[PDB]
């Protein structure tokens, strides 16, 4: 269809079959991308633990669609999880640059559970937690039942020892034990790199992980540069009956009786107290001014999350492809052939001297 670059070229970075707070292994990703056009190295160690590493084969324009993961379900099965946010932008990728793609994974669900007492709470036979809510208007002892927030997807590269974020798609927040929202949190999108990507507010439930921060709370979702491993349940949930509902990989915040905050460039706020009806807030996404925003941040991801990097060249006079991209003004020239630049007059591409 297109003479120059073929828009059928697409790599699909998935969770490699993995789910919960721990990132994919090398063996999982080798089976996942078995006989595909995609080949990656998964980090076993450091902040790169669970992060897939893909090399750009040649300097060319590729559109990166990141899909952050959905939050976990709470102690109420009727309540729908907050679906993960996607960011579609068209970027110029440089030869030999290693792109680090962390696919954010769905947050762990609270109900059903293998524990006897907790399973009665999950089927609604035993509302011992509602009994505590009645006397205190908050949960202090019977903590648990909030699903951990969904982990965000971080797609970046390394340049001169500095990680440069390209596409970060936010994860949706987990549902509380007393999950009572009918409206999910509007898709949050950043496009300015000067805005520090810190974690979300963490109270009793853990807030989402950001780009870079220092997580002190065991239940709070860790940032990208801390490995972005999803935070644990609140200490009371872990103590009482061991109800561990961690956030998903990619900065998923941990669940208490309140829902965990979803990951992002900036993490999503979880509840300030252990209010069992405070559902976790979604994270903030990101897109670098290095690329052209194809479409605003959109909730599309139902569960585990993913990334699709494809060749899409969006030109008003050639919309799927069939044009070249001038990186400096971030403008596409639909006339430019091999070894030509547009004329300085605004008239057609002449042979570049």
C-alpha positions as semicolon CSV with decimal commas, in nm:
position;residue;x (nm);y (nm);z (nm)
1;X;0,000;0,000;0,000
2;X;0,267;0,251;0,116
3;X;0,584;0,280;-0,114
4;X;0,837;0,382;0,166
5;X;0,767;0,254;0,527
6;X;0,517;-0,036;0,574
7;X;0,248;0,038;0,848
8;X;0,199;-0,347;0,900
9;X;0,521;-0,348;1,114
10;X;0,413;-0,388;1,483
11;X;0,578;-0,536;1,799
12;X;0,351;-0,639;2,091
13;X;0,515;-0,621;2,437
14;X;0,290;-0,811;2,683
15;X;0,317;-0,919;3,051
16;X;0,471;-1,247;2,913
17;X;0,181;-1,433;3,087
18;X;0,278;-1,280;3,427
19;X;0,031;-1,111;3,668
20;X;0,042;-0,934;4,009
21;X;0,331;-0,723;4,170
22;X;0,624;-0,924;4,020
23;X;0,743;-0,853;3,664
24;X;0,793;-1,108;3,377
25;X;1,090;-1,350;3,357
26;X;1,315;-1,409;3,051
27;X;1,172;-1,764;2,999
28;X;0,810;-1,629;3,008
29;X;0,889;-1,356;2,745
30;X;1,078;-1,604;2,517
31;X;0,764;-1,825;2,512
32;X;0,535;-1,515;2,470
33;X;0,735;-1,370;2,173
34;X;0,814;-1,719;2,035
35;X;0,826;-1,698;1,649
36;X;0,729;-1,321;1,653
37;X;0,917;-1,017;1,506
38;X;0,986;-0,921;1,873
39;X;1,296;-1,027;2,074
40;X;1,375;-0,869;2,418
41;X;1,607;-0,917;2,719
42;X;1,428;-0,910;3,059
43;X;1,627;-0,755;3,346
44;X;1,691;-1,004;3,631
45;X;1,837;-0,737;3,867
46;X;1,853;-0,367;3,964
47;X;1,570;-0,113;3,875
48;X;1,558;-0,306;3,540
49;X;1,413;-0,615;3,719
50;X;1,105;-0,724;3,515
51;X;1,172;-0,455;3,247
52;X;1,204;-0,577;2,883
53;X;1,493;-0,432;2,676
54;X;1,440;-0,396;2,296
55;X;1,704;-0,241;2,062
56;X;1,602;0,000;1,780
57;X;1,750;-0,176;1,461
58;X;1,783;0,155;1,264
59;X;1,697;0,527;1,309
60;X;1,331;0,553;1,193
61;X;0,995;0,690;1,315
62;X;0,781;0,439;1,515
63;X;0,452;0,513;1,698
64;X;0,446;0,375;2,055
65;X;0,107;0,285;2,210
66;X;0,149;0,208;2,581
67;X;-0,137;0,041;2,774
68;X;-0,131;0,069;3,154
69;X;-0,307;-0,206;3,352
70;X;-0,646;-0,214;3,526
71;X;-0,681;-0,203;3,908
72;X;-0,776;-0,503;4,124
73;X;-1,131;-0,581;4,241
74;X;-1,225;-0,530;4,605
75;X;-1,431;-0,733;4,853
76;X;-1,749;-0,655;4,653
77;X;-1,774;-0,874;4,337
78;X;-2,052;-0,647;4,194
79;X;-1,803;-0,357;4,158
80;X;-1,616;-0,318;3,828
81;X;-1,234;-0,253;3,832
82;X;-1,089;0,080;3,702
83;X;-0,961;-0,001;3,348
84;X;-0,606;0,109;3,259
85;X;-0,516;0,422;3,059
86;X;-0,339;0,417;2,714
87;X;-0,106;0,680;2,555
88;X;-0,058;0,678;2,173
89;X;0,228;0,900;2,044
90;X;0,450;0,895;1,732
91;X;0,827;0,907;1,817
92;X;1,155;0,911;1,628
93;X;1,371;0,621;1,757
94;X;1,752;0,628;1,721
95;X;1,964;0,330;1,602
96;X;2,122;0,107;1,875
97;X;1,916;0,283;2,150
98;X;1,787;0,034;2,405
99;X;1,420;0,100;2,479
100;X;1,316;-0,022;2,822
101;X;0,951;-0,133;2,817
102;X;0,798;-0,211;3,155
103;X;0,453;-0,358;3,086
104;X;0,230;-0,271;3,383
105;X;0,038;-0,575;3,521
106;X;-0,322;-0,591;3,665
107;X;-0,352;-0,537;4,045
108;X;-0,438;-0,840;4,267
109;X;-0,810;-0,897;4,345
110;X;-0,928;-0,929;4,707
111;X;-1,220;-1,170;4,652
112;X;-1,252;-1,467;4,618
113;X;-0,970;-1,591;4,854
114;X;-0,838;-1,936;4,960
115;X;-0,861;-1,837;5,335
116;X;-1,174;-1,982;5,515
117;X;-1,284;-1,672;5,715
118;X;-1,198;-1,428;5,431
119;X;-1,398;-1,642;5,177
120;X;-1,713;-1,604;5,399
121;X;-1,646;-1,226;5,395
122;X;-1,599;-1,245;5,012
123;X;-1,935;-1,429;4,953
124;X;-2,112;-1,186;5,194
125;X;-2,194;-1,457;5,455
126;X;-1,981;-1,272;5,716
127;X;-1,972;-0,886;5,716
128;X;-1,757;-0,862;6,039
129;X;-1,578;-0,566;5,868
130;X;-1,919;-0,379;5,818
131;X;-1,977;-0,448;6,191
132;X;-1,650;-0,257;6,269
133;X;-1,743;0,022;6,017
134;X;-2,072;0,057;6,214
135;X;-1,890;0,121;6,549
136;X;-1,587;0,331;6,420
137;X;-1,688;0,461;6,067
138;X;-1,346;0,323;5,959
139;X;-1,157;-0,012;5,965
140;X;-0,874;-0,052;6,224
141;X;-0,852;-0,434;6,289
142;X;-1,030;-0,626;6,006
143;X;-0,819;-0,450;5,737
144;X;-0,821;-0,605;5,390
145;X;-1,064;-0,642;5,101
146;X;-0,925;-0,365;4,883
147;X;-0,772;-0,476;4,552
148;X;-0,428;-0,333;4,474
149;X;-0,406;-0,062;4,205
150;X;-0,308;-0,159;3,849
151;X;0,055;-0,102;3,753
152;X;0,148;0,154;3,486
153;X;0,347;0,088;3,171
154;X;0,680;0,281;3,146
155;X;0,841;0,300;2,796
156;X;1,169;0,495;2,795
157;X;1,535;0,478;2,680
158;X;1,882;0,547;2,831
159;X;2,072;0,852;2,696
160;X;2,404;0,973;2,856
161;X;2,329;0,787;3,183
162;X;1,985;0,960;3,206
163;X;1,652;0,765;3,159
164;X;1,433;0,965;2,913
165;X;1,053;0,875;2,940
166;X;0,874;0,846;2,599
167;X;0,531;0,682;2,664
168;X;0,403;0,612;3,017
169;X;0,046;0,478;3,031
170;X;-0,116;0,505;3,377
171;X;-0,272;0,214;3,567
172;X;-0,630;0,234;3,700
173;X;-0,691;0,231;4,079
174;X;-0,803;-0,080;4,272
175;X;-1,151;-0,114;4,426
176;X;-1,200;-0,089;4,805
177;X;-1,365;-0,354;5,034
178;X;-1,662;-0,117;5,055
179;X;-1,619;-0,015;4,688
180;X;-1,900;0,237;4,618
181;X;-1,790;0,437;4,305
182;X;-1,996;0,410;3,983
183;X;-1,763;0,664;3,806
184;X;-1,392;0,588;3,738
185;X;-1,125;0,862;3,758
186;X;-1,073;1,076;3,433
187;X;-0,763;0,976;3,226
188;X;-0,472;1,183;3,364
189;X;-0,197;1,273;3,109
190;X;0,125;1,474;3,154
191;X;0,335;1,598;2,855
192;X;0,591;1,820;3,041
193;X;0,908;1,646;3,173
194;X;0,982;1,927;3,432
195;X;0,685;1,799;3,641
196;X;0,856;1,556;3,890
197;X;0,717;1,203;3,866
198;X;0,676;1,124;4,238
199;X;0,454;0,851;4,395
200;X;0,088;0,916;4,489
201;X;-0,034;1,000;4,842
202;X;-0,022;0,678;5,048
203;X;-0,226;0,650;5,369
204;X;-0,351;0,310;5,490
205;X;-0,380;0,187;5,131
206;X;-0,070;0,229;4,912
207;X;-0,065;0,494;4,639
208;X;0,079;0,432;4,292
209;X;0,448;0,451;4,201
210;X;0,580;0,739;3,993
211;X;0,880;0,775;3,760
212;X;1,133;0,838;4,044
213;X;1,073;0,866;4,422
214;X;1,171;0,701;4,757
215;X;0,901;0,461;4,888
216;X;0,925;0,420;5,271
217;X;0,583;0,249;5,310
218;X;0,580;-0,132;5,246
219;X;0,222;-0,105;5,111
220;X;0,296;0,195;4,880
221;X;0,365;0,124;4,508
222;X;0,736;0,170;4,420
223;X;0,849;0,408;4,138
224;X;1,002;0,299;3,798
225;X;1,362;0,357;3,922
226;X;1,284;0,137;4,232
227;X;1,188;-0,154;3,997
228;X;0,818;-0,045;4,008
229;X;0,724;-0,362;4,205
230;X;0,361;-0,336;4,331
231;X;0,325;-0,243;4,702
232;X;0,204;-0,490;4,974
233;X;-0,126;-0,483;5,171
234;X;-0,147;-0,257;5,482
235;X;0,037;-0,414;5,793
236;X;-0,297;-0,475;5,973
237;X;-0,434;-0,680;5,673
238;X;-0,105;-0,877;5,669
239;X;-0,119;-0,930;6,051
240;X;-0,490;-1,013;6,103
241;X;-0,550;-1,287;5,843
242;X;-0,262;-1,233;5,593
243;X;-0,494;-1,080;5,326
244;X;-0,217;-0,985;5,078
245;X;-0,359;-0,798;4,777
246;X;-0,059;-0,622;4,622
247;X;-0,076;-0,375;4,336
248;X;0,030;-0,483;3,988
249;X;0,386;-0,449;3,852
250;X;0,455;-0,093;3,724
251;X;0,385;0,093;4,049
252;X;0,053;-0,063;4,146
253;X;-0,032;0,054;4,501
254;X;-0,128;-0,198;4,772
255;X;-0,482;-0,256;4,900
256;X;-0,603;-0,219;5,262
257;X;-0,983;-0,197;5,335
258;X;-0,950;0,105;5,103
259;X;-0,848;0,057;4,735
260;X;-0,485;0,091;4,619
261;X;-0,380;0,384;4,396
262;X;-0,287;0,299;4,033
263;X;0,069;0,359;3,902
264;X;0,187;0,631;3,660
265;X;0,452;0,890;3,573
266;X;0,305;1,042;3,890
267;X;0,136;0,776;4,108
268;X;-0,239;0,782;4,185
269;X;-0,346;0,879;4,540
270;X;-0,481;0,597;4,760
271;X;-0,698;0,676;5,067
272;X;-0,544;0,896;5,343
273;X;-0,706;0,680;5,616
274;X;-0,851;0,321;5,615
275;X;-1,194;0,440;5,500
276;X;-1,329;0,110;5,346
277;X;-1,536;0,299;5,078
278;X;-1,246;0,510;4,940
279;X;-1,170;0,357;4,597
280;X;-0,810;0,407;4,473
281;X;-0,735;0,693;4,227
282;X;-0,573;0,626;3,886
283;X;-0,215;0,738;3,810
284;X;-0,095;1,018;3,580
285;X;0,027;0,911;3,233
286;X;0,308;1,080;3,030
287;X;0,413;1,153;2,671
288;X;0,748;1,321;2,585
289;X;0,751;1,640;2,359
290;X;1,007;1,434;2,153
291;X;0,698;1,275;1,984
292;X;0,358;1,384;1,845
293;X;0,047;1,300;2,056
294;X;-0,173;1,095;1,815
295;X;-0,470;1,081;2,057
296;X;-0,535;1,187;2,430
297;X;-0,504;0,936;2,720
298;X;-0,787;0,670;2,693
299;X;-0,915;0,387;2,920
300;X;-0,909;0,077;2,691
301;X;-0,704;-0,183;2,888
302;X;-0,926;-0,442;3,061
303;X;-0,659;-0,633;3,262
304;X;-0,288;-0,731;3,235
305;X;-0,174;-0,433;3,016
306;X;0,061;-0,428;2,711
307;X;0,248;-0,209;2,451
308;X;0,212;-0,199;2,071
309;X;0,492;-0,020;1,881
310;X;0,400;0,006;1,511
311;X;0,504;0,214;1,211
312;X;0,240;0,490;1,179
313;X;0,328;0,820;0,998
314;X;0,030;1,062;1,044
315;X;0,037;1,325;0,766
316;X;-0,282;1,530;0,681
317;X;-0,191;1,453;0,308
318;X;-0,088;1,083;0,374
319;X;-0,241;0,966;0,708
320;X;-0,131;0,597;0,758
321;X;0,226;0,656;0,627
322;X;0,381;0,757;0,280
323;X;0,563;1,064;0,426
324;X;0,891;1,145;0,611
325;X;0,922;1,324;0,948
326;X;1,144;1,631;1,010
327;X;1,235;1,568;1,384
328;X;1,340;1,926;1,463
329;X;1,004;2,104;1,402
330;X;0,817;1,769;1,462
331;X;0,662;1,819;1,116
332;X;0,598;1,560;0,845
333;X;0,692;1,629;0,480
334;X;0,465;1,424;0,245
335;X;0,677;1,501;-0,070
336;X;1,025;1,414;0,072
337;X;1,191;1,115;-0,101
338;X;1,529;0,946;-0,005
339;X;1,810;1,204;0,046
340;X;1,580;1,508;-0,004
341;X;1,480;1,793;0,230
342;X;1,189;2,037;0,169
343;X;1,297;2,367;0,000
344;X;1,346;2,667;0,237
345;X;1,067;2,850;0,042
346;X;0,790;2,609;0,159
347;X;0,797;2,461;-0,194
348;X;0,870;2,089;-0,261
349;X;1,154;1,864;-0,133
350;X;1,477;1,913;-0,337
351;X;1,792;1,690;-0,314
352;X;1,967;1,770;0,020
353;X;2,325;1,917;-0,048
